[PDB]
Amino acid sequence: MYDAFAKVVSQADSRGAYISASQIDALSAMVADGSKRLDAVNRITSNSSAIVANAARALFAEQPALIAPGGNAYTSRRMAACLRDMEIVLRYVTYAIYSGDASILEDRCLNGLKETYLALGTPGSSVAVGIGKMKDAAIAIANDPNGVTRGDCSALMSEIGSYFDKAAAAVA
Amino acid sequence: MYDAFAKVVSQADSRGAYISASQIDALSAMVADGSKRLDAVNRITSNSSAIVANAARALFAEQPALIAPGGNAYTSRRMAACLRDMEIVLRYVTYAIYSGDASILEDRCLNGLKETYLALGTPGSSVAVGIGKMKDAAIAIANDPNGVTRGDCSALMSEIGSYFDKAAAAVA
Amino acid sequence: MYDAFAKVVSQADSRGAYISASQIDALSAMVADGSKRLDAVNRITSNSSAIVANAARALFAEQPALIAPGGNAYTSRRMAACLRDMEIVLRYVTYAIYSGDASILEDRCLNGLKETYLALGTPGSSVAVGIGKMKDAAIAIANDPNGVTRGDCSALMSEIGSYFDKAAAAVA
Amino acid sequence: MYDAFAKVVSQADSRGAYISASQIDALSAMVADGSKRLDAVNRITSNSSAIVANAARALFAEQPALIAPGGNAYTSRRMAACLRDMEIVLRYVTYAIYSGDASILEDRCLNGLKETYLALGTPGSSVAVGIGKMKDAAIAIANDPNGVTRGDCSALMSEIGSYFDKAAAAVA
Amino acid sequence: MYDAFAKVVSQADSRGAYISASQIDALSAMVADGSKRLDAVNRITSNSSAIVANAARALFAEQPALIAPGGNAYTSRRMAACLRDMEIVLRYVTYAIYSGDASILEDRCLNGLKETYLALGTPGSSVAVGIGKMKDAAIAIANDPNGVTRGDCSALMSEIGSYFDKAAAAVA
Amino acid sequence: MYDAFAKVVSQADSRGAYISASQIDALSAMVADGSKRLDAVNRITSNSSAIVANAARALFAEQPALIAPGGNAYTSRRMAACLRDMEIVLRYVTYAIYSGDASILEDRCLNGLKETYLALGTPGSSVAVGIGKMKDAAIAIANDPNGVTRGDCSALMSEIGSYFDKAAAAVA
Amino acid sequence: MKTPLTEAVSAADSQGRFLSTTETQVAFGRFRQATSGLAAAKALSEKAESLASGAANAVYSKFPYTTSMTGANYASSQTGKDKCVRDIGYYIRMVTYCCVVGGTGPMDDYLVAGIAEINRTFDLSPSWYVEALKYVKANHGLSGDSAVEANSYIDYAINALS
Amino acid sequence: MKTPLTEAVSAADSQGRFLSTTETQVAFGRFRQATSGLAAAKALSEKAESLASGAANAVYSKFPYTTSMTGANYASSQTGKDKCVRDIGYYIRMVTYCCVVGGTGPMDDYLVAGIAEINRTFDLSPSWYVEALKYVKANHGLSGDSAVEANSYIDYAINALS
Amino acid sequence: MKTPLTEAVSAADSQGRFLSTTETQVAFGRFRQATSGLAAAKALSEKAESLASGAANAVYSKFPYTTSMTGANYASSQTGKDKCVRDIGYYIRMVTYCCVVGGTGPMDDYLVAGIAEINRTFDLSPSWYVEALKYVKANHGLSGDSAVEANSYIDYAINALS
Amino acid sequence: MKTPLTEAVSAADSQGRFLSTTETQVAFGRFRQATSGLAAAKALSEKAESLASGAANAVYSKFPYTTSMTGANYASSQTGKDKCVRDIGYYIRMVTYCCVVGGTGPMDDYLVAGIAEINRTFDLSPSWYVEALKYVKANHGLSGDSAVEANSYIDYAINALS
Amino acid sequence: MKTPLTEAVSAADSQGRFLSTTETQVAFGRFRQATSGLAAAKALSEKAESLASGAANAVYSKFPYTTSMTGANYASSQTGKDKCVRDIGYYIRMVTYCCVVGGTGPMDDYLVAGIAEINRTFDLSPSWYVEALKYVKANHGLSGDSAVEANSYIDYAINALS
Amino acid sequence: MKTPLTEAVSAADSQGRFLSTTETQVAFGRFRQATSGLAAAKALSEKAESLASGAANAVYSKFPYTTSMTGANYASSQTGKDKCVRDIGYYIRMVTYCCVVGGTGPMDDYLVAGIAEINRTFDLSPSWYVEALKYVKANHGLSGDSAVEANSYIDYAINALS
Ligand SMILES: *[C@@H](C)[C@H]1/C(=C/c2[nH]c(/C=C3N=C(/C=C4\NC(=O)C(CC)=C4C)C(C)=C\3CCC(=O)O)c(CCC(=O)O)c2C)NC(=O)[C@@H]1C
């Protein structure tokens, strides 16, 4: 995987180039927002169980066919695998937030997921819905002004949302 | 794999359904003939070496090309593999007779077997001929009225034939 | 793998045939030139590191793009892999020379290699060039008239040349 | 492992002897009490979770030092391992009851156990107490006259008791 | 392994106690001088190859018997092994300095080492001498007032010496 | 393992010495007996099945307790293992003869064999008797005056006997 | 899935062996149980609806807070009550399946593997289900081998939850 | 036990490598955190007894049945109430340990590994403990990084239970 | 040793499972089989001496050269004749053991594993033993399940030899 | 296929090494022996027809029942005699191959591997073939090193059958 | 590639864990370091050409034979001098990349892995590069943490070469 | 230790087989080679002292800085000169051992395995030894097979250093 810093370096090496004063400024920006970034990671993580459970409950309520006998989420083993997948995606998304780069999420989580679900007969559109519900709940908790020094986290939230969207689009 | 009972349950669970009074009668019929089924398994199994050897001998006699220098059954190693395959197919067929379902035969013996033979240059059609000779010998042994309480095993012999035919058709 | 003797046998067996008095003559001729064969192997092997180093140097001199940043041979890891490949091919070629048969070279070195380089983005035509430089250097050392009993090894150098050419054609 | 039948056979073969008419009668006798034996296994097994929990609870009440901080049963990991040991012993005892021979319990559970506890600092005598508690509970449940065809299981209870004692004795 | 903080926690848990306000101050101390500790680790590590090389040279100069033919450090394989051992001990000592606890060193390096040496015929007393030389050099490098903010590192050097002394005493 | 030449080298290197006179010219002597050595290996090897079978038959004839029920050679699996060991010892002895050094026999065959037999209840004393019988047969075959250029193979037979004697001694 | 018959086959297959009288005994034991097993499945299926609602009410009675405390995990709403009756019906249906195949296979494949994760995630108490299973055992009205067998699987679920 | 320092060493060791500036950064991060961490450990220790008893009472108020229902798993006896307050004290003490080492290591090693088995066997509801944990979070009186860090461990435990 | 009972136990143990109704069925099959199994063992044992002698004579008649040709592998000598009836008695005895345990286990452990090596080394023909086994089968005098079971073990041996 | 040369190469390969003087000595040994081996192979292929026929007759003489006893595994029929002569011809041809490559390779690949399964299934006696092989060794008319080499391959096959 | 952040993620991922305060500390340490790290990378890139040329001359001065002896591996030709300043430029650039990510990762991935094979194959002495690297240290004109960090990566390369 | 004979045995042993005419050919090759090999070993030994000092001088001529530069790794002091002639003597002695056993085994076991580490650690250039080896080759005075074999080992060492 790459973090934000390593991504720049790898694109520089293939050019035999030094990191530009420009790219340095962009990395300096990320560093300046570093504490906000870790607050977001801590907050989403500290609510991981509820985020998954609440998103799954809502999903099954909107799509009762998923849990009716014969449905993909029917039986304990399948229900548990479903909940596990939700937790997995949330986990890899937080890795991407922490690292400031999507490679971890794409490489170790999204790669081949669509095709896996195809082979199993798991409905990807439904997974994408579950992922979007986690996204909204996660940003909501991350961006709550209560209990944190006041300041603007808008760019971070837009970045957080892009990682969730990438996950959803990978299986939609 | 499934046996006859498990097959019915799996089909019911996907519909969220209790097994019907009708499906029950059908399972009762199998149980009623259970001793006949076990005699058949015992008898074919107790003659496994002869059924293989005799079927192989007759095969090579009908098709001298198989054992001629250059033939697929030529050389000790290839003849041994050939005899092994005959015994493997017979063995999996008896498992099917025993469990009252073809799944064990399909899943662990026949799946990918055509492809395998094709890639080796092993003549599937000749294998099918061998299997058919084993089938005829097996049914004659299983349905021999000597030394067993007299009754009607025609349904069972039909079922036994169907497994051998499934094997033959998978490679022919 | 086959050596020259084993190759003949394998062709005879599939025909159920004894080796001909003619094929024996041929093998007899190879045995006759056996010491020349071993000189060539010893001489090439004894200069293996220089053959690889000098060929590699010449390749990169002729194709600087290979070692420019972003080039397939740029970075120590990729440079090291490239040198390794050179050594590997030379090694398998000497194996073929020693056994008087290309099977070892085909089976354990060349088979699938073109596809490997394609997956990697490694330029096979550049590998072909390196392989040809090694060939020129190997034949020059093997065919040096100094310090050996004088005789004609022309047929041997052609055979040697054919193994290098087989290698170069496989990756081109 | 041996079951009761195999045990007698192994002793006979070392003597080159046929099993005696009297040994056969003894086997016939255990066979005659087979369904009693099976009821016993089912009853004990069907209460495995309660037998373990109740015996552990009473053990800890008797020896508070076990659960005081710094005790061998203190911390969740040690408590869990302790419960697991209790369930393992119960499980292997039921295997002994089922097979009518102590070999399974001896070979796969008790062998090297006293030494393991000694190394760990686990109090063997405390485990023995827990096992004795399981014995009393298990026998009381196995020998309950309600809900079963009335008869004498006194020989069976003595055998069962003997397996629990053997386990207790191995770590005391 | 434990670092300094974890060691204190484990001692506290075994008594079911909150760490003593006293214990808190001692850990807070390590924290206060953390920058110094990390300078020491950086400097020693930054001179690792030189520390090993010079200490080994010195050892062989003082004990020519080690490198004479038939000597334990004679032959390239044994010399390389000897140099490897020196580097391994230095590395594990730096792990102990970084973590502020000896457990990593004792558990993954020193445990079983004397016995390994006795079995091989490696003279542990000689290894101990080489280790002492590494110690004197490591502390000299770590405690050099040039190129660092001036201050007192005496307590740290004493801790560092203790780890090296631990390693030597284990094989002496 | 060492062969005779390698053993000499290792003794020399431990003293940092070039090959000595007593070692040199001598080795020349072993080389000069090389064809006789290979006659012995070929003759013993070419009769390996008979040497094992005849020696086993004579051992069991002499020590009937080995094959009576309860004997260590009783049952097919034990008989088979017994014949295997005899074949194995003979095989390793031939390696010793061929290489002119006992190290192959000691390192891969004899080391820990005595202890293995003691753990299994195999009577080493009886194994030694079987080995002695193979020795006598093997030497008679190797030293048969018929079908070979006549000469003195006495020193060789003495060396061969010593390898057999080492093997018998190791288990007796 | 696991049944006495498929287990017998898997054991033989793993050793590369034809079947022998060992597996014949397994089958004769299976065929002996099947009649009373199939009878249990039949009778349970006829009482299923009544057993499930009766068991649900038994849980509410023992744990009365489950019908008043606010939360999606509770049967204080009609939705929650219906979930609960559905779940108990699942346990009953699984018990019939085990009776049909002569083993815990179906219960394992469809219900027990993963059950702990479900109860943790959705905040459902295993004790609730244990009480439901106890009621079923008290009210199925089976007798003889049909009851012994059905109870073995009910008690197996109870052990899994405790 | 896992801490930021032992994990850095573990990673280097598994690669057979000397420590580098990567591990130096880990330690600087640790030393930046450690002071506010030890402060939280100390504050919690002083309030531990009050927090545990207050948390127990909060549980009883949320789930009154835990003080009336009969059974060794409930706080309907003095022995049961004592067990409960003990248990909550354990949680609080594990949190201070986590603050001392800068990670979940102590909670994992001493409490979380095996907790599910304990709760299943002794019939204790994870929900009881989540409520108790929410009380300590609302009452420890920490702020700044001391609160942020302490709460991350409390929430980690809540996550383990749900 | 493998028996229907040890095999049931082994299967459960490998899965870390308590026994269940699945293994109950195995035992009921075993107990149903044991009556006639034990009867076969007793009756064979009583006829053992006569079956072994009669079987060796049937072999001598089928393969006359076996009492004619010289060689340690033949029954042309008294010693050879004694080895032969001894060997045949071993087979009969193993059959009795198989009937006692309800499986091929004793036959496998004591006789079949390694039989190929023995026949190769000592130049014994498998077909001699097949003939012997056919005679035992035609002359043991068993009926019903006793005969079916004993014959299954005899045929098992014949299979392993062919 | 194994030969002195391919085994020299195989050893070097698995160690990732270039060939050395060690392998040169292997090839020098091969090339020296090859003259004799090739001579043996030519001469054998010329005597093969009458050697195979003569060896069959030697087997019939040693084992008279082989031409009187009824059965597909015997040479009591013309088809049986033909199979037998063919088989022996197979052994002789493999021996020529071995002389050609300087090792047991061809004989292993094409005949020895699986031979035990063939003789078992078709009820052919290894002793028949040992007798044929002895006849071949005593009558091939080779001398000196040619004979010594061919005899080693013949005795290799005998060892394999015994 | 390795950085303090990707190593934290990797450790967590290998354990199937969410990030915790442990990894938060890693990140704070990273962020603390990055400002001086980026400054180092900035200054070095601005002085890179001067540093590489200066270091090459330092090498030629320490080892004069390197500009006198003929051979492609030496700097006695213009091509050789150009190779040498190029190589030193590579080292310097790698040091900047390490400063950017806060670890040895880039230098390992792009330069150190395989460096041994290159120097052996092309007959280049590590001591030349060690001398070059010492020049860079003595001349980059860095101060404070920027220097300590850059020097750490330079010394890392020296260690790898020695 | 690798030699033609131990390699032959190792190959047979890994396949659990007796030796065959294949290994006989290996030994014949070894035996025919040994005369020339033992003669090379004797002659090299007799010139050993002269060759080592001559070789050392050759290295000093080709790399003059080696006798002028200050450093423990150089031959500027008598001590350094003595180390150097000793090392070269080691190479020559290993060459004689290779000639004794007919393979690279001695040189691998005692010198080549770990040589890279030694040269890196002590800052010794492979090129110095390559030059020493070139001198030995040009000055040993060997002819015929003795020279070809001895040179094979010298070139093998040169390859290992480059
Ligand atoms: C063509 C490649 C060149 C050539 C070869 C050539 N060689 C010989 C003769 C021999 N070659 C050897 C080789 C070795 N002897 C060894 O001991 C070793 C390793 C230790 C090797 C590799 C030997 C022993 C001989 C025979 C004795 C001799 O030295 O002459 C010939 C002569 C014809 C023949 O086949 O013997 C030839 C032609 N000759 C050339 O001119 C080419 C440059």
Distances, alpha carbon K19 to alpha carbons D24, H22, H116, in Å:
66, 18, 21
> Structure tokens of J26?
């292997």
User: Which is the closest atom of ligand 1 to the Cα of C39?
Assistant: 22
Q: Which two tokens stand for residue D84?
A: 């697991």
CA H108, CA H159: separation in Å to the nearest integer?
12
Q: What is the DSSP string of chain J?
A: ---HHHHHHHHHHHTT----HHHHHHHHHHHHHHHHHHHHHHHHHHHHHHHHHHHHHHHHHH-GGGGTS-STTSSSSHHHHHHHHHHHHHHHHHHHHHHHHTSSHHHIIIIITTHHHHHHHTT--HHHHHHHHHHHHHHS---HHHHHHHHHHHHHHHHHT-
Query: Which residue's CA is the closest to the ligand 1 atom numbered 28?
Result: C149
**Strands, DSSP E only, in I24-127?**
none
Helix, strand or coil, per DSSP, at residue A168 = helix
In terms of C-beta distances under 8 Å and separation of at least 24 residues, what long-range contacts does E104-110 make, across chains too?
E104/E1, E104/H6, E104/H9, E104/H13, E105/E163, E105/E166, E105/E167, E106/E166, E107/E1, E108/E1, E108/H13, E109/E167, E110/E166, E110/E167, E110/E170, E110/E171
Distance of alpha carbon A42 from alpha carbon I153, whole angstroms: 69
Return the structure tokens found at F166: 């080492």
Cα–Cα dist K74/L119, whole Å: 20
Which of L120, L122, L129, L130 is the mutation pick for testing K, counting most K CBs within 10 A? Answer: L120
Sign of CA dihedral J137, J141, J145, J150: negative
Interacting residues of F138 by C-beta distance below 8 A, sequence separation 6+: F44, F47, F51, F90, F93, F160, F164
Q: Judge whether L135 and L154 are in contact, CB under 8 Å.
A: no
Residue E68 amino acid letter? A
The answer to whether F172 and F125 are in contact (CB under 8 A) is: yes
Resolution (A): 2.0
Longest dimension (CA), chain K: 60
**Residue C29 burial (C-beta neighbours within 10 Å; 0-12, 13-18, 19+):** exposed
Q: What angle do CA L143, L145, L147 make, to 5 degrees?
A: 45
Q: Is B28 on the interface with A (CB under 8 A)?
A: no
Question: Residue I27 and residue I33: Cα distance in Å, rounded?
Answer: 10
| Interface membership of D14 toward F (CB under 8 Å) | yes
Confirm whether residue E87 is marked as ligand binding.
yes
* Helices marked H in chain C: 4-13, 21-32, 34-45, 48-62, 76-99, 103-105, 113-120, 124-142, 154-171
Residue reference for tokens 């485990």: D127
Quick check: A47 contacting H, CB < 8 Å?
yes
The token pair at D96 is: 């002994």
Atom of ligand 1 nearest to the CA of L149: 20
DSSP B66: G
Residue C148 near residue C39 (C-beta atoms within 8 A): yes
Token pair 């393979």 is at which residue? Answer: L103
Contact present, F52 and F83 (Cβ < 8 Å): yes
Number of domains in chain L: 1
Find the CB nearest I65 among J65, J123, J162.
J65
Cβ neighbours, 10 Å, residue D142: 23
Residue ranges of domains in chain A:
1-172
User: Any chain E CB within 8 A of the CB of H12?
Assistant: yes
Cα–Cα distances in angstroms (integers) from residue B136 to residues B148, B149, J54, in the given order: 20, 22, 41
- Report the C-alpha gap between K29 and K31 in whole angstroms: 6
Token couple for G55 = 């068991």
Q: Which two tokens stand for residue I86?
A: 């001894």
Of B35, B45, B98, the CB nearest to G9: B98
Task: Note down the domain range covering I77.
Answer: 1-162
Rounded CA-CA distance I66/I59 in Å is 8
How far is L55 from L47, CA to CA, in rounded Å? Answer: 12
Structure tokens at E51: 């520390």
Closest residue to atom 15 of ligand 1, CA basis: L145
| Number of residues written out for chain D | 172
CATH superfamily of A1-172: Phycocyanins (1.10.490.20)
CB under 8 A, 24+ apart: contacts of B101-106? B101/B1, B101/B2, B101/B3, B101/B4, B101/B6, B101/B7, B102/B162, B102/B163, B102/B166, B103/B1, B103/B2, B103/B7, B104/B1, B104/G6, B104/G9, B104/G13, B105/B163, B105/B166, B105/B167, B106/B166
> What b-and-e string marks burial along C114-129, b requiring 16 or more CB atoms within 10 Å of the CB?
beebeeeebbbebbbb
CA atoms within 13 A on the CB side of I145: 18
Distance from CA of J125 to the nearest CA of C (A): 24
Å between H162 CA and nearest CA of chain A:
6
* CA K98 – CA A158 distance, rounded (Å): 29
> Tokens in use for G4?
């006495």
Strands (DSSP E) along G89-162, which ranges?
A: none
Residue D50 with chain G: CB contacts under 8 Å = 162
Residue pointed to by tokens 């002195």: J4
Report CA dihedral (E51, E54, E56, E60) to the nearest 10 degrees: -160
Are H68 and H76 in contact by the 8 Å Cβ rule? The answer is yes
* C-alpha of residue C25 to centroid of ligand 1, in Å: 21
Q: Which approach determined this entry?
A: X-ray
DSSP assignment letter at K65: G
Q: Calculate helix-pair angle for J126-139, J21-62, nearest 10 degrees.
A: 110
DSSP 3-state of I134: helix
Q: What is the dihedral of CA J101, J102, J104, J110, to 10 degrees?
A: 10
For testing contact with chain H, the best of D49, D60, D76, D88 (most H CBs within 10 A): D76
Burial class (CB in 10 A: 0-12, 13-18, 19+), B108: middle
CB contact at 8 A, E97 and E159 = yes
Give exposure, I73-84, as e/b (b: 16+ Cβ within 10 Å): bbbbeeebbebb
Which residue type, as a one-letter code, is found at position I26? V
A65 inside 8 A of chain B by CB: no
* Chain G neighbors (3+ CB pairs < 8 Å): A, B, D, H, I
The two three-digit tokens of residue C48, written as one number = 């293996």
Q: Are E171 and E130 in contact (CB under 8 A)?
A: no
No. of helices (H) and no. of strands (E), chain C:
9, 0
Known binding residue C43? Answer is: no
C42 in contact with chain L, both atoms CB, cutoff 8 A: yes
Compute the distance from residue J155 Cα to the ligand 1 centre, in Å: 36
Interface residue H63 vs chain D (CB under 8 A)? no
Cβ atoms of residues E102 and E96 within 8 Å: yes
Is L17 annotated to bind a ligand? Reply is no
Query: Using the beta-carbon criterion (under 8 Å), do H28 and K32 form an inter-chain contact?
Result: yes
- How far apart are the CA of I148 and the nearest CA of chain F, in angstroms? 26
> At residue C71, what are phi and psi to the nearest 5 degrees?
-70, 155
Question: Are the C-beta atoms of residues B46 and I159 closer than 8 Å to each other?
Answer: yes
Other beta carbons within 10 angstroms of residue A30's beta carbon come to: 18
Sequence-distant (6+) residues with CB within 8 A of A145 are none
The answer to whether E172 touches E109, Cβ cutoff 8 Å, is no
Nearest by Cα to B42 from I25, G27, I11: G27
F40 neighbourhood in chain J, CB within 8 Å: none
Q: Check CB contact under 8 Å for F16 and L93.
A: yes
Identity of residue J61: S
Phi and psi torsions of F68, nearest 5°: -65, 150
**Is C53 at the interface with chain L, CB within 8 A?**
yes
Q: What is the Cα–Cα distance from C46 to L155, expressed in whole angstroms?
A: 5
> What span, in angstroms and rounded, lies between the C-alpha atoms of K142 and A73?
60
Other Cβ atoms within 10 Å of B140 Cβ, number: 14
Burial I100-133 (b: 16+ CB within 10 A, else e): bbbbbbbbbbbbbbbbbbbbbbbbbbbbbbbbbb
Taking CB atoms and an 8 Å limit, are I159 and B46 in contact across chains?
yes
> Is residue H100 a contact partner of residue H37, using CB atoms and an 8 Å limit?
yes
Q: H148, H149, H156, H161: which to substitute to probe chain A, counting the most A Cβ within 10 Å?
A: H148
**CATH number of the CATH domain containing L138:** 1.10.490.20
Structure tokens at E170: 């284990």
From residue I71, alpha-carbon distances to C108, I38, J129 in Å are: 52, 40, 17
The number of residues in chain A equals 172
Q: Choose one of C36, C97, C139, C157 to mutate for the ligand 1 pocket test, by most ligand atoms within 8 angstroms of C-beta.
A: C36
Q: Is G30 annotated as a binding residue?
A: no
Give the orientation angle of helix E76-99 with respect to helix L115-122, to 10 degrees. 60
Are residues K71 and K19 in contact, defined by beta-carbon separation less than 8 angstroms? Answer: no
Residues of C in contact with J93 (CB under 8 A): 16, 18
Q: Which of F2, F10, F15, F3 is nearest to F100 (CA)?
A: F3
Rounded distance, CA F114 to CA A1, Å?
A: 56
The answer to whether D134 touches D90, Cβ cutoff 8 Å, is: yes
Q: Is B145 on the interface with C (CB under 8 A)?
A: no
Chain L residues 92-131 with CB within 8 Å of chain E: 109-115, 117-118, 121-122
From residue J38, alpha-carbon distances to C92, H153, J31, J142 in Å are 28, 82, 11, 12
Residues with CB under 6 A from ligand 1: C 35-36, 38-40, 42, 142-145, 148-151, 153, 156; J 21, 24; L 145, 148-149, 152
Q: Is L86 annotated as a binding residue?
A: yes
DSSP helix/strand/coil, L101:
helix
Residues C138 and C45: beta-carbon distance below 8 Å: no
Q: What is the sign of the dihedral through the CA atoms of J91, J97, J98 and J104?
A: negative
CA distance L123 to E53: 10
